[PDB]
Amino acid sequence: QNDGAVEITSTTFESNTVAKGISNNLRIDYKILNKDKLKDGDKIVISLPDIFKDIEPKCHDQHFKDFDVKDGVVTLTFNENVEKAVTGYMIIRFVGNSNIRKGVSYPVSIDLNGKPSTVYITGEEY
């Protein structure tokens, strides 16, 4: 996922499993490669299945001018005024909800301006 303005270098969950009432964090490592190629509306979109309570993005507010959570879709909007090329990371904090079923593979899509990727986390019940 590299459009010349931005590269997503890594997308990793703290744990490969998710459970009701248990925290997991998604970490997204990125580089702003070329601030001059950024445009207002450039974004990372994370689409989640309905297995989370408490979706909370954490980011560098000079790299992302806004973030929004709506109906399981997290939008991170790049700051087109970022001062310079930079390496960073952001986190989506998650808590599982009671919809989680043991062994079920849940897709999480991470899209850099419609350049897509999918990672999978599996349900656990305790």
Side-chain angles (χ1 to χ4, degrees), residues 22-90:
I22 303 296
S23 289
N24 201 345
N25 295 319
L26 169 61
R27 180 167 164 149
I28 302 179
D29 285 82
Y30 59 84
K31 302 176 70 158
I32 300 171
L33 299 167
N34 185 334
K35 76 176 170 53
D36 289 340
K37 288 178 182 281
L38 277 180
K39 285 179 202 64
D40 180 14
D42 290 350
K43 56 182 181 213
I44 302 173
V45 180
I46 305 91
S47 302
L48 303 161
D50 184 17
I51 58 164
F52 301 112
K53 68 153 87 68
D54 301 344
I55 302 163
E56 184 192 0
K58 310 202 94 79
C59 69
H60 195 305
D61 72 4
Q62 300 309 290
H63 308 177
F64 300 98
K65 60 178 177 171
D66 191 35
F67 63 78
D68 169 62
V69 182
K70 179 177 143 74
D71 296 356
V73 182
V74 180
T75 305
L76 311 175
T77 303
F78 284 103
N79 182 20
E80 73 263 31
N81 291 330
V82 65
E83 159 184 356
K84 57 168 171 196
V86 63
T87 300
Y89 75 97
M90 62 86 55

